[PDB]
């Protein structure tokens, strides 16, 4: 009786939200940006190939100086690369080799990683002893760690396969806030540029916008037909793009609370692993299962170019903060740095 | 053209590269085994004979190092992390023979043996384990022998025309699991009958792993 009545009210509320989004859908982003000229053909060359990982690369993250990056492989090694020289700055042996994510702190003093061991390990890069040591092991998730991102040297957000995201106080080792509401494994998270919000994509094909300080879900974004594997905020923080196993990328707007544009092609039938934006946000770069990275025109939904330089899955990618280059990691154990030439 | 510190930084990277190769060679001598199976299937008893997330077991038998990984604690979606185990030497699958007549506790109407068959079929025919051999352990053979006399095998298999002898009953179950394999050419299934008092289980794994390693070496050397 009471349970049946309540679940009927949820359906009425869902229709109310769907009607509200349709009311403000006066135009389409495609119609708005039809007049502007296309970006043309984007040609990028492999400037660097980072060799040394002996297994599948699962994650990479640029440092904020746009020169150092950290990559994770399931050979149990975290490696920090000098991308300008291809020099290896550090090689961090992992206690558990089943790593799925890695993060570089914005300060550059810490890196984080974790996988099937259900632990987010924080590594101190600046020690008087001259070696990288574990400073914290964040336990508390009951599923695998899928993504992690530093807010500062003391705060980090983790998404897990136990359907929850958590905000951690690194100094005390305790999760201050727990973000619940996903009905599937949360696969990714992205921080807003002001680090007041973050979006997460789960295997329930939905993206939720979370308030870091308040600790609740502000908005829920649906439209994908399969698990979301990747998510990335727009550079101004007012939009985000997702990548799913249904071979599509969608651009959702925070303020309009709805999808604005879909980025898919008939030839593309493989899942999407990673998404990122260029510095101005005009380009959406997506890594795919078909061994390629497709550069999209964000405004016009045109495939601007292809980065074809890997013989296995493109597992991760990232664009520098200055926008100078894009790094692609792959299951073939190589990282490549790309940018164009005049 | 490099500066004094740049040359030192390049030399540090070479030192790191040397240690990465040594770690890769050391990790290449380890046999990685993925341990799978249903609950109450002798999966924990096998680990005892072999002596919060993934559980890793290390043991050495005749100058060969084995790394056995148990992922029974992972209650998340299997497909999101099962590719992480692509490239293991072999998969160890544990099946309780005594659970042929028992009913799964959760469903209360599904036979446990059929539940193991569904788990075996998905893992064996998974796209990430096309070339991965499977070591099949059929535990509780002594308890299965006792249950056969009281309970015929026809309960589990309605289309079973065989007798109630232990040898015929056990062989029929072995063939049913091997018939679930669709990649007969690319992979091979090794089946063994284990008990609580058995001590040859480590020898069977070593023999099955050595056969798998040699076949991979022949494929790498061009003979296969």
């Amino acid at each position, epitope marked *: 009786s009471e349970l049946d009545q309540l679940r009927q009210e949820a359906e009425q509320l869902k229709n109310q939200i769907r009607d509200a989004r349709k009311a403000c859908a006066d135009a389409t982003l495609s119609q708005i940006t039809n007049n502007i000229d296309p970006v043309g053909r984007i040609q990028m060359r492999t400037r660097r190939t980072l060799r040394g990982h002996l297994a599948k690369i699962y994650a990479m993250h640029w440092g904020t100086d746009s020169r150092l990056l950290v990559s994770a492989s399931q050979d149990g090694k975290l490696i920090i690369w*000098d991308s300008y020289t291809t*020099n290896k700055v550090h090689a961090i042996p992992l206690r558990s080799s089943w790593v799925m994510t890695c993060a570089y702190a914005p300060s550059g003093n810490y890196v984080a990683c974790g996988g099937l061991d259900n632990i987010c390990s924080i590594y101190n890069l600046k020690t008087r*002893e001259g070696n990288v040591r574990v400073s914290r092991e964040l336990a508390g998730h009951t599923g695998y760690l899928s993504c992690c991102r530093f807010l500062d040297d003391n705060q980090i957000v983790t998404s897990s396969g136990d359907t929850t995201c958590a905000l951690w106080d690194i100094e005390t080792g305790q999760q201050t806030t727990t973000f619940t509401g996903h009905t599937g494994d949360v696969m990714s998270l992205s921080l807003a540029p002001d680090t007041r919000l973050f979006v997460s994509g789960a295997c329930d094909a939905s993206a939720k916008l979370w308030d870091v300080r308040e600790g609740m879900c502000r908005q829920t974004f649906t439209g994908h037909e399969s698990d979301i594997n990747a998510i990335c905020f727009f550079p101004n923080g007012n939009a985000f793009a997702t990548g799913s196993d249904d071979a599509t990328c969608r651009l959702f707007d925070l303020r309009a609370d709805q999808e604005l544009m879909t980025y898919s092609h008939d030839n593309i039938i493989c899942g999407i692993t990673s998404v990122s934006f260029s510095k101005s946000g005009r380009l959406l770069l997506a890594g795919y299962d078909d061994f390629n990275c497709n550069v999209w025109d964000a405004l016009k939904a045109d495939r601007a170019g292809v980065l074809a330089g890997h013989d296995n899955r493109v597992s991760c990618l990232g664009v520098t903060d200055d926008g100078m280059a894009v790094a692609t990691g792959s299951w073939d154990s190589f990282l490549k740095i790309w940018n164009g030439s005049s | 053209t490099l*500066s*004094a*510190e740049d*040359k*030192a*930084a390049v*030399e540090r990277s070479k030192m790191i590269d040397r240690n990465l190769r040594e770690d890769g060679e050391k990790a290449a001598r380890e046999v990685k085994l993925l341990l799978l199976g249903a609950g109450e299937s002798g999966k924990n008893t096998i680990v005892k004979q072999m002596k919060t997330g993934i559980v890793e077991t290390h043991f050495t038998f005749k100058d060969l190092h084995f790394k056995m990984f148990d992922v029974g604690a992972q209650r998340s979606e299997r497909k999101k992390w099962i590719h992480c185990f692509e490239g293991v030497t072999a998969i160890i699958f544990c099946v309780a023979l005594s659970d042929y007549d028992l009913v799964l506790a959760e469903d209360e109407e599904m036979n446990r043996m059929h539940a193991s068959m569904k788990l075996f079929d998905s893992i064996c025919n998974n796209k990430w384990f096309t070339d991965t051999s499977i070591i099949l352990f059929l535990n509780k053979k002594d308890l299965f022998e006792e249950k056969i006399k009281k309970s015929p095998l026809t309960i589990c298999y309605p289309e079973y025309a065989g007798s109630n002898t232990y040898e015929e009953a056990a062989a029929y179950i072995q063939c049913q699991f091997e018939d679930l394999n669709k990649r007969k050419d690319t992979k091979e299934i090794y089946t063994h009958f284990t008990c609580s008092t058995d001590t040859k289980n480590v020898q069977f794994v070593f023999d099955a792993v050595t056969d798998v390693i040699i076949k991979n070496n022949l494929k790498d050397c061009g003979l296969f």
Partner: single-chain antibody
Amino acid sequence: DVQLVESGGGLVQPGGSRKLSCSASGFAFSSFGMHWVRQAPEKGLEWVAYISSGSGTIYYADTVKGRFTISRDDPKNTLFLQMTSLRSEDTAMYYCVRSIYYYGSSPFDFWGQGTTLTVSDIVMTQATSSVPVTPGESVSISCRSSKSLLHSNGNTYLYWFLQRPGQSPQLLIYRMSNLASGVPDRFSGSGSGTAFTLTISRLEAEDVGVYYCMQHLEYPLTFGAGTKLEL
């Protein structure tokens, strides 16, 4: 804590041989390159030798090449300096210096206490030998180089050290602008090309000492004469 203890120094006859040891504790010794730097009594610093991490690269100053041998024992965390044919020119305090090299590292950050031995090229100029100072007032120290210390990679390999009376040198500024860990922000390094300035805002009693500018553009590493601050 990070420690570097030197031993084996003492009074030796001219033409003799002596073995200096530097035992390291509290840090990953095998990861650091090591230098020997000596300082003659009432004189400035003089670089002696260098052995890299992994023992692959070894450098010597011309004045000691062929007579000194530098070696390390990574399992024992010991740094060695085998000296032969010792001359009266070798009478100095020999310092053991650790230095790690990667992008953004701070070489020459920790020095040992030193051991005293008594026997019976880019030019770095610090013309001002001494500067009378008062607490709370801003002081600037100038250094010059015969060659441009700015490399084509954008780094300017100029270092600033402070040797307080009775103490080993400590790193203040590395690569001409960066502030070493544990150094107050009042110190600031400014330079261009061949001319460099170390500015000390709100001078305190602890800042009193000799300041050395070192170039790390190429070997041999050379020090300035040193500028002394006195009250």
